[PDB]
RNA sequence: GGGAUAAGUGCUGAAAGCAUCUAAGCAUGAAGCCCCCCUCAAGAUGAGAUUUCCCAACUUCGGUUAUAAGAUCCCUCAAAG
RNA sequence: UUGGCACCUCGAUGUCGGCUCAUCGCAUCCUGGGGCUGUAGUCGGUCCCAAGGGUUGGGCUGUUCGCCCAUUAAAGCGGUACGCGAGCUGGGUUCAGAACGUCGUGAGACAGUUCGGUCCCUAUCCGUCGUGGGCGUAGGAAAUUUGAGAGGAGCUGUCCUU
């Protein structure tokens with residue numbers, strides 16, 4: 001007998017969290033945040049709807065790497081023009097655009113679906129300790 | 145660092161102090177007024193907005209761009225100026241040296257100033273690869289059926305496509321163009337004209353923007 | 361500089377060192393400078 | 398690490414004070430402050446200091462030796478200072494003082510100016526013996542190295558700027 | 574011209590009492606990298622910013638309405654096509 | 655590269671060279687930076703970093719190559735269906751004519767030669783170069799704009815002085 005609960009927009013409640021990147025490892029913080037954004041931490045998780053929460057990440061500039069990733073991890077992109085490869089190292093990207101670093105790391109751990117795009121749009125990253133979302137009343141979230 | 149707006153009148157020549165022939169462009173740069181002052185605090189960057197060439201006042205049943213509409217009239221009246229035909233910002237100037245409503249006379253530039261001139265190049269319409277991109281023709285004889293064609297657009301199975309940036313026929317000219325390191329030959333304050341050494345982009349009557357040259 | 365997979369002393373004054381992950385020989389004799397590669 | 402174990406002797410005129418890792422040594426000639434390895438402990442005696450490492454790991458031994466050497470260098474720099482002497486070889490190769498800056502004429506079509514830095518003093522003798530004096534051994538070495546690299550010694554006649562005790566390999570320039 | 578680098582060149586420096594450009598630390602170093610220069614660019618759906626303009630009646634009181642600012646149709650044209 | 659194999663294609667995947675248009679790699683020809691030298695200087699030799707840009711007209715030959723004339727800072731080496739024939743050519747090569755040498759009794763034949771000898775196609779899709787309309791960007795409008803991104807550019811001689 002079919003009895004499995006299905007979340008839908010009428011009964012989904014999305015909260016706002018704040019997570020501090022300071023002293024955290026890029027990938028491990030990223031995987032946890034991605035779980036939160038997808039709603040894998042809710043007993044009402046329903047794959048065809050977004051049951052996830054909004055996440056604000058602060059102190060993106062204080063994320064840390066192990067090994068020599070700061071100089072040796074290279075992000076490549078292509079402009080779709082011949083010879084159009086451009087690269088930037090992980091350390092330089094942390095220096096110049098830490099928000100983008102965190103965002104790409106997290107979004108690479110979300111499915112490439114319309115729903116995954118929408119869920120990734122609930123992510124907000126800030127290099128410093130302040131965010132403009134006091135109006136959303138976010139709760140601190142402790143990793144792990 | 146200075147800036148002004150003018151119309152291209154045409155080309156002529158002047159004889160220099162040693163009798164050398166100096167080709168010049170005549171730029172009429174009357175009726176330049178500082179309409180707005182943009183600042184880092186309000187707008188996020190510093191610049192002066194200059195309006196050039198008074199147009200007619202707003203009227204009820206206006207049908208052309210000759211008459212200022214109400215938004216433009218309000219914007220200009222805030223500076224206490226008549227409405228203007230062309231409006232451009234200069235970021236290269238010291239904003240503190242200008243007041244809104246100020247006149248910008250051709251006398252701001254002096255003979256010998258090195259300047260950059262920006263304009264819209266003359267339009268050519270739809271043009272082929274030889275004219276638009278300066279390519280070579282094929283043979284005109286020896287059995288040729290390739291004269292003005294653009295040539296091969298790719299290779300083969302690798303890459304089974306044409307790459308972006310391939311040069312092909314299309315509209316030519318009408319581009320923003322900056323010519324750097326021209327020189328102010330003369331300033332005629334009675335006629336409100338600047339003689340610029342050489343030639344500058346665009347048709348006659350086209351808007352030209354003169355700035356202190358960026359490279360030094 | 362001698363750049364070669366085989367880096368080793370050429371004379372008794374040659375000194376094997378390691379810099380930036382590379383085996384090298386430094387010596388009073390400039391001919392004997394070697395970097396592995 | 399014998400260097401790490403070795404104790405630093407403090408002259409009576411030199412005072413060493415620690416603020417966690419960061420340390421500062423004052424003496425007759427000046428003050429030198431720097432941040433030492435955070436995992437190293439310091440036994441501060443009235444007249445001497447000793448450096449202690451926590452373990453016998455490779456990193457601990459290396460950092461112990463270098464920390465002891467650096468602190469001893471700070472002490473000796475405040476006490477006696479450090480000096481490096483270069484000399485100029487070649488006809489017309491001369492040096493002189495443009496106040497505090499050093500201007501060198503060494504076979505170039507232009508003179509070369511070396512601007513003085515804080516805590517460093519240049520002195521020219523006989524127009525051909527330059528000396529750099531300071532409290533920082535590292536800074537003295539760096540500035541002397543810059544002076545020498547302006548034109549280092551060439552092998553066919555030895556001309557150029559050398560450290561006074563430096564041995565310059567010589568070569569026979571011309572043969573039939 | 575600036576910033577960071579390559580091969581290098583060094584300073585200080587231990588592991589390893591010496592030595593050592595390297596481990597910590599500090600310099601310097603290419604037409605190359607990132608800028609500086611020129612052009613496009615907010616469909617940058619993350620759709621940004623500034624200045625100015627317009628602003629009421631009627632309503633089953635959700636909403637509508639033609640009008641406003643404005644822009645077009647149509648017409649005379651060219652520096653544009 | 656010369657091959658080996660015979661796996662796609664024989665209800666067709668056009669084949670050498672040239673022209674037009676390039677694009678990429680670096681194992682670098684020049685220009686930039688270095689180490690060693692049996693580097694006096696001017697020159698060189700050899701190796702390392704470096705792919706930004708640049709890297710010529712002619713004589714002969716179908717030629718590619720190659721030799722030669724004259725230059726240049728230099729006259730790089732390769733991949734892209736030995737790039738590119740629904741972009742061009744058609745000299746060679748691979749139809750039918752004819753001929754020479756040669757082989758064959760002969761009909762004929764020859765990576766032997768010679769002279770002659772039909773190169774079709776109105777672009778549907780992606781791709782590419784231009785140029786418009788719709789809606790969105792939580793009121794409707796006119797101007798001025800930031801710059802996330804993207805593209806362009808990037809080469810070098812000689813002489814004078816020191």
Ligand SMILES: [Mg+2]
Pocket residue numbers: 284288289
């Ligand atoms: Mg024809």
Ligand SMILES: [Mg+2]
Pocket residue numbers: 301303304305
């Ligand atoms: Mg393909």
Ligand SMILES: [Mg+2]
Pocket residue numbers: 366
């Ligand atoms: Mg060998």
Ligand SMILES: [Mg+2]
Pocket residue numbers: none
């Ligand atoms: Mg078989």
Ligand SMILES: [Mg+2]
Pocket residue numbers: none
């Ligand atoms: Mg078929």
Ligand SMILES: [Mg+2]
Pocket residue numbers: 680
């Ligand atoms: Mg290479």
Ligand SMILES: [Mg+2]
Pocket residue numbers: 705706
């Ligand atoms: Mg190159």
Ligand SMILES: [Mg+2]
Pocket residue numbers: none
């Ligand atoms: Mg081919």
Ligand SMILES: [Mg+2]
Pocket residue numbers: none
């Ligand atoms: Mg084809």
Ligand SMILES: [Mg+2]
Pocket residue numbers: none
């Ligand atoms: Mg033929």
Ligand SMILES: [Mg+2]
Pocket residue numbers: none
């Ligand atoms: Mg045959």
Ligand SMILES: [Mg+2]
Pocket residue numbers: 770
């Ligand atoms: Mg015939």
Ligand SMILES: [Zn+2]
Pocket residue numbers: 370371372373374387388389392
């Ligand atoms: Zn040796």
